[PDB]
Structure formats: C-alpha cells, structure tokens
C-alpha cells in the first residue's frame, strides 16, 4: 500500500487543464447569471415601490396594490416551479448535494429558466428568501450544462464542474470567495466517502464569478457596519453563553421549518392551484408587511447595519425577531424558490444584538458595545442549524471585515454546534436531503 501512497503523493494536484479551463468558463457564466438575477430582483422591488407612489393617495388601495403585486409575483413563481421543475422548490442546496451523491438528477434545461425567473418573482416580490439558494442551484446546473455541452466524461469532471458552479454561485451572492470555497469543502461535498473534486478548479471558478460580480457592483457593500470595538479576554465567556443560546434554538428552529413544511403541504394536498394560491397569499402578505413594517419582510440585509449600531429598541428587536421567525418559516417551508442563509443572518444579528444590549447593562465594567455581539451572532444560526460553522464564520468575516472579533465569532459558533448536538438536531440541509430520499422510498 505504501507504494500506492508514494505513487499518489508523487501524482498529487495534477488536474487536467481542460477541467480547469471549463471551471473558468463556468465561473464566468455563473457570475454573469448571478449579476443579471440580482439586478432583475432589484428592478422589480424598485418598480413595485414605484407603483406605491402612483397610488399613494387612497391608503386602502395602497395596502391593496402592495398585496396584489406581491401575490401576482409569488403566484407566478410557485406556478413556474410546481408546473415545470418541482425540484427548483426551496433552497436547492439539498438537491445539489444529492446530485453530488449521484442520487438526484440535474435537469438544467428546466431548472435554469425556472429557478431564475421563478426566484425573480418571489425575491422581486418581497418574500423573506435570500439569493443564495437560487444562485447556488443555477450555478450547479450551469456546471452540468457545460459538462453536457462539451460531453466531458469521468466522475471528477462531473463532480468538479458541478461543485465549482455551486461555489461561484455562493460567492456571487455574497461577494465572498473564501466562503464560497469553504462551503463546498465543508458541506456540499460527500461527507462520508472520498471524492474527485479539484479544489483548484473550484478556486478558478469562484475567482471568475467574483470578478464578474465586481464588474457590476463596484463601490458598495452588502453590509457596511464599520470598525467595531475589540474583545477583552474576560468577555469571551459571554460569547460562549450566547452560543449556548443559539445552540438550544438551532434544533428547535429546524424542527419548525420541517414541521411547517409538512403542515403547509396539508393545506393544498399537493394541488397546484391551492399551492399557487397559498403562495400568492403568503407573498402578498409579505408585500403588505413590506410597507407597514419593512423590518419583518425582505432579505433582511437592510436591517442588519441598523440593529448592529444599536438604533433599535429592545422591544423592537423582540418584535422584529418573532415576526421574522414567522415570515421566514412561512416563506421557506412553503416550498417557494429561495435561500435561507440571509434570513438566518438577519435573525442571528437581531438575537445577537439583543443579547449584547442585555450584556451591556449587566456589565458596565466590560465597556461592551452590542454590535460585537451582533457580529458574533450573525453567523451563529448558520452554525447551529445548517451546522457548517467554518463557512458561516468566514462569510460573516468577509462581509463585516472585523477580523479582531475572530475569536468571539469562533467561540460563539462553536458553542452553538456543541449545544445543538447535545440537544439532538440535524444539519438542516442533510435532514432535508434525507427527507427527499426517504420519501423516494416507501413510495415503491
């Protein structure tokens, strides 16, 4: 065996130039697609908020047109999915993990146009869903599409091009190349067996799509929080406790998303019309809340800098929290096309902040600033629910550029994954794939 090992070492890191070049082309396409998607969404939210001025007089007519618009967009989305590609429903990440396990097809000819225009409807309609799902899935399918277009053979090419397209998608959703690479090598990849995935190719693809992102989003940030304060050693324990809180809440939140997934399937029993209409109702409800109390709807990115700065009151924080737990559950569980990463970033921020506030009044001698707890908690829900701490920590880092909070962030995120395990719970994406795969049997 030692002779085989020696042979492999001596042959390590030699990826066929063709796969690398195709990873470059994939990265470029995924990046362009993610830019186009983001712009379309923004344009829709804009138009919608522009109609509210052409009808800004009759208040009831306002609360009416907000709802109608959002309903029509949500409905268009649910329709496009339920009618053409059922698989493009929800996050899309589980499905792609399945494809990495060769247990789920990659019908790109269907998913690409459906996930794109479908998500455009739901996101542009104001629903509490992120761009992460749609872009990562479109990424993967783009990778499959190029694989098929150049009829590339071998597991590696199939596995590599699929994984890079996914990573570049994540990169282009958050402008976070490192988070995009780490996500594949911590969550997406098969967790129980070896794989022929070329990291360097993933790298190339991510770089390419991130550059495509920069070509269209120069001089702006998704989340500008500025430079926060430092964290003394004697304050570290506070970040542990907060992790324990996320730890008890992580599993619970997972139970709810899955439960609500079932409970809502009952309401329409799988009927495409009761489905499309239920979605139209949730969507419209979001467009409605998107005016009355904006902090309860949308992606949540907007309310992050504010909450971190301490501009919200405790009561406002609790309100926003509960309302968002409800709208997030309602939107994701309903099978609507969208991600759950950002909503969880928002929730984590709010919870983290509230905790910081409490801490501040309880420990004046620590000279705390609630925002450090907001940043530490921002990725804590991704650590407790999806259970991919390293990717969350690096994503937050890449978005908030507050590396001096690195230790607290790791301490908080680790506490969450430690407490989430000893309270049971499962990696939400894994639980979902395990669910699709279980429902695929017992149905034979």
């Amino acid at each position, epitope marked *: 065996r030692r002779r085989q090992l020696i042979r492999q070492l001596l042959e390590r890191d030699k990826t066929p130039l063709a796969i690398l070049f195709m990873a470059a082309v994939v990265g470029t396409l995924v990046g362009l697609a993610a830019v186009a998607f983001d712009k379309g969404v923004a344009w829709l939210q804009n138009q919608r908020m522009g109609a509210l001025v052409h009808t800004a007089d009759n208040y009831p007519l306002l609360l009416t047109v907000a709802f109608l618009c959002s309903a029509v967009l949500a409905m268009f989305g649910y329709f496009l999915v339920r009618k053409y590609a059922p698989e493009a429903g929800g996050s899309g990440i589980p499905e792609i993990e399945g494809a990495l396990e060769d247990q789920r097809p990659v019908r790109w000819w269907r998913v690409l146009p459906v996930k794109f225009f479908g998500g455009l409807g739901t996101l542009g309609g104001g629903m509490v869903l992120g761009r992460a799902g749609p872009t990562v899935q479109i990424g993967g399918n783009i990778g499959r599409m190029v694989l098929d277009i150049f009829r590339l053979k071998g597991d590696e090419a199939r596995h590599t091009l699929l994984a890079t397209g996914a990573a570049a998608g994540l990169a282009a959703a958050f402008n976070a190349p490192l988070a995009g690479i780490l996500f594949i090598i911590e969550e997406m990849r098969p967790q129980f067996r070896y794989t022929l995935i070329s990291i360097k190719a993933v790298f190339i693809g991510v770089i390419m799509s991130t550059i495509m992102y920069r070509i269209f989003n120069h001089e702006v940030a998704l989340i500008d929080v500025g430079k926060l*304060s430092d964290a003394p050693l*004697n*304050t570290l324990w506070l970040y542990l406790i907060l992790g324990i809180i996320f730890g008890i809440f992580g599993p619970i939140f997972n139970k709810w998303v899955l439960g609500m997934q079932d409970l809502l399937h009952r309401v329409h029993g799988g009927n495409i019309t009761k489905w499309v209409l239920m979605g139209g109702a949730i969507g419209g409800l979001c467009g409605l809340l998107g005016f009355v109390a904006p902090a309860t709807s949308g992606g949540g990115f907007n309310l992050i800098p504010i909450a971190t700065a301490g501009n919200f009151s405790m009561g406002m924080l609790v309100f926003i929290f509960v309302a968002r737990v409800i709208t997030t559950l309602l939107c994701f569980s309903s099978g609507a096309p969208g991600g759950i990463f950002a909503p969880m970033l928002a929730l984590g921020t709010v919870l983290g902040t509230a905790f910081g506030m409490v801490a501040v009044e309880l*420990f*004046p*001698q620590y*000279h705390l*600033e609630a925002g450090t707890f907001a940043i530490a908690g921002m990725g804590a829900l991704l650590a407790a629910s999806i259970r991919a701490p390293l990717t969350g920590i690096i994503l937050v880092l890449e978005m908030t550029d507050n590396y001096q909070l690195i230790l607290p962030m790791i301490i908080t995120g680790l506490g969450a994954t430690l407490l989430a395990q000893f309270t049971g719970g499962k990696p939400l994406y894994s639980a979902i794939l395990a669910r699709t795969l279980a429902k695929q049997e017992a149905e034979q």
Partner: antibody, heavy 120, light 107 residues
Framework: VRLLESGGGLVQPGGSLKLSCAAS????????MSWVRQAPGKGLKWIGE????????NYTPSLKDKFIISRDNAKDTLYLQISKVRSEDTALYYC??????????????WGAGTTVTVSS | DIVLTQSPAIMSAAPGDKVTMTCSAS?????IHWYQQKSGTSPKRWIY???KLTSGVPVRFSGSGSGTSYSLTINTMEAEDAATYYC?????????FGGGTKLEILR
C-alpha cells in the same frame, strides 16, 4: 502621547465651568476617555467615562446634570462641564485615556491636570 | 461600591530593603492596578492586572495578592522609589481607588 487639560481656575459658588482636554500623539477615536479628580490632600475619585462614539457615558453616583462629559473626535478634545459648583468641587482634575490587559480596565495615560478653585 | 483600604498610610524605609504595602478590599476583587504619584506630578500606571509591570518599571518592583487582599512589594528599594502609591480596581463597577500610601526615604 500627550494629554493637556485646560479651562480650570477660579469660579464663584453656584456658577458653572467647562474643562477641556487636548489629546495628541495617537488615534483619539478607538479610545475610551475618562475624568478623575483629586481633592487637596485627599485621595483620587472617578468622575466619569465616555466611549468613542459618545453612545455611552457613565458617571460617578452623583446626581443629574452636575456633570456633563462630552467629546469631539474631530478636534481630538474631551470636555467636562460642571454646574452648581460647591467647595467639594475644588480639586485637581485629570483626564485619562482608558485601556486594559486581560479586560479589567485601567487608567492607561493621565494628564498633568487642571486646578479648579471654587470661591467668592 | 467597593472600598479599598491601603494598610499603611505612611512608611519610612532606608535604601536597599524589602518594603511591602497592603491593599485590602471590602468585597472580592481581581486584577488590581497600582499607580505611582510623585509630589507635584501626575500619577503613572506602575503595576496592573495584580502583577504585570508597565513598560519602564524596574524589576525591583513586584505585586501580588488575591480575593480580598493584595500587596505591592519593592525588593531592595532605591531613592527614586519615594512617592505615593494608589491601588485601583475595576473588577466591579464603578471603579474605586485606595487611600494611597506615602513612601518616605528614611535616612
């Protein structure tokens, strides 16, 4: 690193005066500033502290607007307004930059201080 | 708020001698600090976190203690050690200071 506080002097009882503290030789912004005073022949006594963005300002257990601590990061200057001055307020006033080791904060660097005299 | 009482208000010691001053706390404290104040001049952070020396403080200077009793010590005292030493604790809010200890050069 220098802390030069001025404004002190003779003030009539019940009157009010504003002490200033000019900071130089370091980034004034990432630092918490604090005021402390020493009455003639007596011990030291903390007056209060103020964080970088002025979002937090704490005082000694002394009532209401008796003390108003402010700061101007644009001029790297710290301010302390005292009102209804009485004899107990006659003392040497020191501004101090705050910092910490393990986290149990200390008074990093002190200034030469300004003398305040309350008399008619 | 915590009351720090320094055991010796005034003490005299000839150069070259182990001098030790106490800082008792009314309650429990941790990682106390020490400041040196020479007549006519501003206080200088000398020892912090109970035993760490500030950059520039001679090795003859040491500090120790725990729970509710701390102490500053000077091994083979010099002539430039004469000053007033104040202990301070921010382990509890608001911070407080000791009554101070006056170190005079016996001769």
């Amino acid at each position: 690193v220098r802390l030069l506080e001025s404004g002190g002097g003779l003030v009539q009882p019940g009157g009010s005066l504003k002490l200033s503290c000019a900071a130089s030789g370091f980034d004034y912004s990432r630092y918490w500033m604090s005021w402390v005073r020493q009455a003639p022949g007596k011990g030291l006594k903390w007056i209060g502290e103020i964080n970088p963005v002025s979002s937090t300002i704490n005082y000694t257990p002394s009532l209401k607007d008796k003390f108003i601590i402010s700061r101007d990061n644009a001029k790297d200057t710290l301010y302390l307004q005292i009102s209804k001055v009485r004899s107990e307020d006659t003392a040497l006033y020191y501004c101090a930059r705050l910092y910490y080791g393990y986290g149990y904060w200390y008074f990093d660097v002190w200034g030469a201080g300004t003398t305040v005299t309350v008399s008619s | 708020d915590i009351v720090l009482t320094q055991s010796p208000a005034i003490m005299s010691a000839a150069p070259g001698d182990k001098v030790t001053m106490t800082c008792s706390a009314s309650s429990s404290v941790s990682y106390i600090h020490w400041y040196q104040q020479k007549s006519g001049t501003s206080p200088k952070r000398w020892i912090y976190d109970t035993s760490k020396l500030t950059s520039g403080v001679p090795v003859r200077f040491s500090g120790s203690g725990s729970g509710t009793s701390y102490s500053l010590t000077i091994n083979t005292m010099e002539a430039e050690d004469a000053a007033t030493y104040y202990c301070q604790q921010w382990s509890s809010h608001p911070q407080t200071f000791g009554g101070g200890t006056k170190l005079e050069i016996l001769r």
